[PDB]
Amino acid sequence: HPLKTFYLAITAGVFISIAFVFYITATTGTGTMPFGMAKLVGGICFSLGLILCVVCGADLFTSTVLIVVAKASGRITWGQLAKNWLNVYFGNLVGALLFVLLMWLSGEYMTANGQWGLNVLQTADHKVHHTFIEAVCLGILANLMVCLAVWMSYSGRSLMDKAFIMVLPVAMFVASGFEHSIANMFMIPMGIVIRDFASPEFWTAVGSAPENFSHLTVMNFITDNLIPVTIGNIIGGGLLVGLTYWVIYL
Amino acid sequence: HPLKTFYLAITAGVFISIAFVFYITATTGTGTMPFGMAKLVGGICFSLGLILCVVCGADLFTSTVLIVVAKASGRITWGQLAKNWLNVYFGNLVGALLFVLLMWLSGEYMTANGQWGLNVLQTADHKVHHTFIEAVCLGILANLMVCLAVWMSYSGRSLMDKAFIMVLPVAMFVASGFEHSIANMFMIPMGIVIRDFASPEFWTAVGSAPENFSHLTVMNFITDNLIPVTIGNIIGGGLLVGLTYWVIYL
Amino acid sequence: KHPLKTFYLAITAGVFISIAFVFYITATTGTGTMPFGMAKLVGGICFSLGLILCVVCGADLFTSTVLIVVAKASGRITWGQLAKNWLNVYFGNLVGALLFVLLMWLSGEYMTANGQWGLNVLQTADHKVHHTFIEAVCLGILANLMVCLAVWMSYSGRSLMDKAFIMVLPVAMFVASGFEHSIANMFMIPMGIVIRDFASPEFWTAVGSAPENFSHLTVMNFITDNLIPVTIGNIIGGGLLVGLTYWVIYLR
Amino acid sequence: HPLKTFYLAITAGVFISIAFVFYITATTGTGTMPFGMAKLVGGICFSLGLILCVVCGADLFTSTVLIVVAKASGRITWGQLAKNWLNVYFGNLVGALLFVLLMWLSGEYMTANGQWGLNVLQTADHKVHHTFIEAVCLGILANLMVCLAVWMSYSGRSLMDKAFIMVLPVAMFVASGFEHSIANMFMIPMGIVIRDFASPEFWTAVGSAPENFSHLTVMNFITDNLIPVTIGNIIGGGLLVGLTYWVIYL
Amino acid sequence: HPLKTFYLAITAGVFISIAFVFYITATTGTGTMPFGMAKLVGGICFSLGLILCVVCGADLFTSTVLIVVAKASGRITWGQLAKNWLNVYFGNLVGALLFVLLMWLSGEYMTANGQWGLNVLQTADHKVHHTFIEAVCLGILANLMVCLAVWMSYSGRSLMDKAFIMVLPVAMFVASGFEHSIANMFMIPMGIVIRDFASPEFWTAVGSAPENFSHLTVMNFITDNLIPVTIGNIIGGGLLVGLTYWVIYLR
User: Fold this and answer.
1) Which of residues 41-80 of D touch A (CB under 8 A)?
2) Which helix (H) or strand (E) holds A179?
3) What is the DSSP string of D21-68?
4) Residue B97: CB atoms within 10 Å
5) Which residues of D84-114 are buried (b: 16+ CB within 10 A; e: fewer)?
6) Which parts of the chain does the record assign to the membrane side Cytoplasmic (chain C)?
7) D-contacting residues in E 86-145 (Cβ below 8 Å)
8) Most Cβ neighbours (<10 Å): which of B102, B225, C80, E55?
9) Contact E55 D152 (CB under 8 A)
10) Which residues of chain E neighbour C112 with C-beta distances below 8 Å?
11) Contact flag E51-D141 (C-beta cutoff 8 Å)
């Protein structure tokens, strides 16, 4: 049902924001840690987002592309196969924005004397510094792992089976910083809010200023991550789709 | 039976205190370690409490809200969902206060040359220094992960699935330090008891003193934490139930 | 029940709990650049191997099963006709821990990691006798709570996976939180004592310490300042769970 | 169909490239860290590529030797069993090169502040630094572990069983750094792309120069790594056939 | 089938050598790490060998000893039993030796700038330094835990159970430094080969001289370690044999 899908898409937006919150939380205070392993533990923590999404059934942009193809044995028609994408997309964003608001209200950016807020500003910052092609390609790369993770999940029967199997694929595109439109729908707007609203005690604790993140604003988010990344994402999904259809009608 | 529910509430209060002690113990001496990792491991250890609770049938204030609604097929009025709430709540409390007690008689505060008891004091102090809205939102975010853990658990094959699916949603809320009213029923009174009743050799070890924790009276506990945290908790359950109503409604 | 069989299952539990503690000492050997909680966690997780040994091989650990033992026969089994057993199992567990002390000594393992291993034993044993009677009982209560809960939660077990990987958290937690368990002690403290009373001069010198740093590691100390109050707290760790269980139950 | 199988081999080629990217990411920034621990953890990350392959039904050169023996129940032919190697091998290669391109365009070679690209250079190089004999022996060793890993995997039930039983055997050959021709197909050429097309800003940022990594070329890769490593790989498969053959045979 | 046994025995030989190699790899350059943490982890790694053995049906000397005793069902008379251990033993051994040669030809003692090969060296040099009493006691402790591991393995439903169960009991016999005759059959000889054939570049890079490892000789491996560890190993097998026997033999 259209409205049902919108609400479950809102839910995914929240699920993915929880994923990123856990990741930021885990990687916060790890300047001394080897970059690989800080990012690794962050990715492993990020997978709560997909274990959640799946185990709970929640529509997340393109995530279940291949499940949907397999629930037709690749003999169903396409309008029927990819209708709601835009409604899901919008539901995802709504969910992520809402969660950002809550997260802001919780005053958590000051966790660890601001280091939490800083991990957000640096993460969200880095993400808005992508050349259109690099961002598309990181978007391709990211949704590759997401779709494959979800896909592999379907063979899993127990709770243990579905979770302990997606952890690796999620941790990999995360700990590699591949770009995912929906995760960034929380992360980048979050770097915005914090940059554009953090008190002086923050900036002072963390030693820094909005100057350092002159790039975190809505306009940049949209044109320098969200757009190229989302595309790359549809390419990642449409790709698995493609290989799917040949392996099947062969 | 009303009184049986009360004993199971008391049991949850106890299981949750077990969880918070394990957490304190994991994180003791982690000023040297990176904030994330220390808190991640803490939260993970803390999940033993929510595992005990579920896999043992203890009643933890509001944890099961989604299940009760699911079973009741969606047809249940709020007064009907809420009758036991106050009974569970207070049974939880007696359980947690009782645990504070045994925990104290065991003389655990001196563990690690005062560093343990000190872990308690710092952890609890930090909680009463919360702005009312921050505390509500932390309470909301706590109960989101709690209900979702219980819910993901509700449909597990193995005992393994039932328990270990919950580990991550728990660890994430405890690593981010969201506020669970009932786990605070142990952490904060445990602090205050140490504050009000610790031996001076203790203060000589930790190099510190009671004035440093002026905000650890019971009144500060209740007004500066327990009240807004319980509120936010309930809101967190209300939002999942409401979400439920959309997808049990459509 | 059957005399010799229960006795050997008991001994075996003593060896299983001793193995638990050894693995703990080994995991937590040399812990400097390491926070207290983290080393104790990793060691305690290492520790649960022992209780997994007991539950999966059916060895008889003093009180570990309390909830099952009363809730099977339905209390349909009388006081003394229930006590004779525990005393037996207990003495068994001890024989086991003790034999394992002998072996772990003959093995010359206290010299492992250049004395550090055996020193780890020394310190870990030193700690356990500096408990006030009350504290030590309360810790006996706390330790057996976790153990019976771990075992208890073990019965819900589906797979081997379920029956084992569930007990790990309640064991690691009781153990890394420093709770007191009488049968584990039956190995740990005597091992501290042999090492402290027999460690070569090369040892004392390599570890950089001395007998007087552990003035308290003596048999009568162990028995009176630990084994008694911890054992008692342990029994209350059982009486507690049984009380709450039977009535939670009888509120039908 | 030769083309469905070529698609599956391409799939394994991509799968194994993803494995190696996860390994580079997991081990980027580890001088403070002990050799064995960082290699072990990169090894563990690596095995995502082989769980992907096996759980998704791809086609990795020789990986399923003992499978196509015992599964055919011994009723299978040498010649009309090994003729496809050529096709699978080429398909693996195209998977490899294609991912090199994607990872190049993604601008990942700069992620982690240049140390991603540096890690690739150091590893990719390292592999062309073996005697013919070292290369072959590392080939037997690598592929011995891969085949045993699948052989154990092809004996499991749940998703867990099928996938986890493979970790130890894979992380093992990867931490020990034994040489698998198919992994080398991504690693070495990706190092070459990075080295040649690597912007001057990159060389400047890491503090190196193409000169540092002279050994990284097509000819050396092919002749001092690829050739001997493939030979040894084949020997490790052959020896597993010989052996497992007599085993499940008598 | 006797020769089949020989092959599964050789295969355990190789299985258990892959065990020790994984171990040397996880533990190279862990000089700075807390002793117990590094060993605990190397021991988590080592269980590859034992899991490989169980899962793939390889026969590791005395490791499945409770089965070689309770299958003939105590009907397992003495001569009737000794007619096999000899075979598995020689098989394990051949397999370990072969893996030694492959590891040497791989050029591997130089990984991490000789630190890996030095790891082998020092671990070799350490096993050869025990009293007879200690070596037997530790051989007892090792095969004891391997038997408990394989034994709890038989109660396992899923593959996941067959393997993850053996992980703690093997990690423990290993992190604790207990002696398993078949695993020493690879490690001490690997140290010897390395010490006897290692390059000038190697000694020079790791900071050392062959002269630091003069205790690593074949005669020493045998009389100082293999004989007593082996005895301990048989006591860790025939011991659970004795015990278990009468346990299920009374009530």
Assistant:
1) 41-42, 45, 47-48, 51-52, 55-56
2) none
3) HHHHHHTSS-SSS-HHHHHHHHHHHHTHHHHHHHHHT---TTTTHHHH
4) 18
5) beebbbebbbebbbebbebbbbbbbbbbbeb
6) 58-84, 154-159
7) 102-103, 105-108, 111-112, 115-116
8) B225
9) yes
10) 176-177
11) no
**E125 to chain D nearest CA, in Å?**
20
Q: Quick one: tokens of A77?
A: 């028609």
A21 in reach of chain B (CB within 8 A):
yes
CATH 1.20.1080.10 corresponds to the domain E1-251:
yes
- C-alpha span between B239 and C176 (Å, rounded): 38
HEC-encoded secondary structure of chain C: CCHHHHHHHHHHHHHHHHHHHHHHHHHCCCCCCCCHHHHHHHHHHHHCHHHHHHHHHCCCCCCCCHHHHHHHHCCCCCCHHHHHHHHHHHHHHHHHHHHHHHHHHHCCCCCCCCCHHHHHHHHHHHHCCCCCHHHHHHHHHHHHHHHHHHHHHHHCCCCHHHHHCCCHHHHHHHHHCCCCCHHHHHHHHHHHHHHHHHCCHHHHHHHCCCHHHHCCCCHHHHHHHHHHHHHHHHHHHHHHHHHHHHHHHHCC
Longest dimension (CA), chain C: 65
Residue B156 neighbours by CB under 8 Å, 6+ apart: A158, A159, B162, B163, B165
Q: Do B137 and A28 touch (CB under 8 A)?
A: no
Q: How far is B134 from chain A (nearest CA, A)?
A: 4
Query: Which of E1, E6, E18 is best to mutate for the D interface (most D CBs within 10 A)?
Result: E18
For chain B, helix (H) and strand (E) counts, in that order, are 12, 0
Tell me which residue of E183, E189, E167 sits closest to E233, measured CA to CA: E183
CB count, 10 Å around CB of B56?
A: 15
Best of D176, D178, D239 to substitute, by most chain E Cβ atoms within 10 angstroms, is: D176
Q: Name the resolution in angstroms.
A: 3.2
Residue D214's Cβ-count burial label (10 Å; 0-12, 13-18, 19+) is exposed
Domain locations in chain D? 1-250
DSSP state of E242: H
Could you tell me where the DSSP H helices lie in chain D?
2-26, 35-46, 48-56, 65-70, 79-82, 85-105, 115-127, 132-153, 159-164, 167-175, 181-197, 200-206, 218-221, 227-249
Using the 8-state DSSP alphabet, how is residue D111 labeled? T
Contact A124, A190 (CB under 8 A): yes
Q: How many CB pairs under 8 A join A and D?
A: 120
Cβ <8 Å between C37 and B25: yes
Cβ of C48 within 8 Å of Cβ of E157? The answer is no
**Nearest-CB residue to C37 (from B1, B27, B55):** B27
Rounded to whole angstroms, the Cα distance separating D238 from D241 reads: 5
CA distance to A92, C119, E98, per residue, from C26 (Å): 50, 11, 32
CB atoms < 10 A from the CB of C203, how many?
20
**Whole-angstrom Cα distance, residue B44 to residue B170?**
7
The CATH architecture one would assign to domain A1-250 is Up-down Bundle (1.20)
Q: Which residues of A touch B175 (CB under 8 A)?
A: 22, 25-26, 45
Q: How many other C-beta atoms can be found within 10 angstroms of the C-beta atom of residue A4? A: 13
Q: By the CB < 8 Å criterion, does E177 face chain D?
A: no
Q: How was this structure determined?
A: X-ray
Interface with chain C: mutation pick from E134, E141, E173, E229, highest number of C CBs within 10 Å:
E141
Tokens of A33: 């840690």
Tokens of C151: 């075992």
Contact state of A25 with B134 under an 8 Å Cβ cutoff: no
- Chains adjacent to A (≥3 CB pairs closer than 8 angstroms): B, D
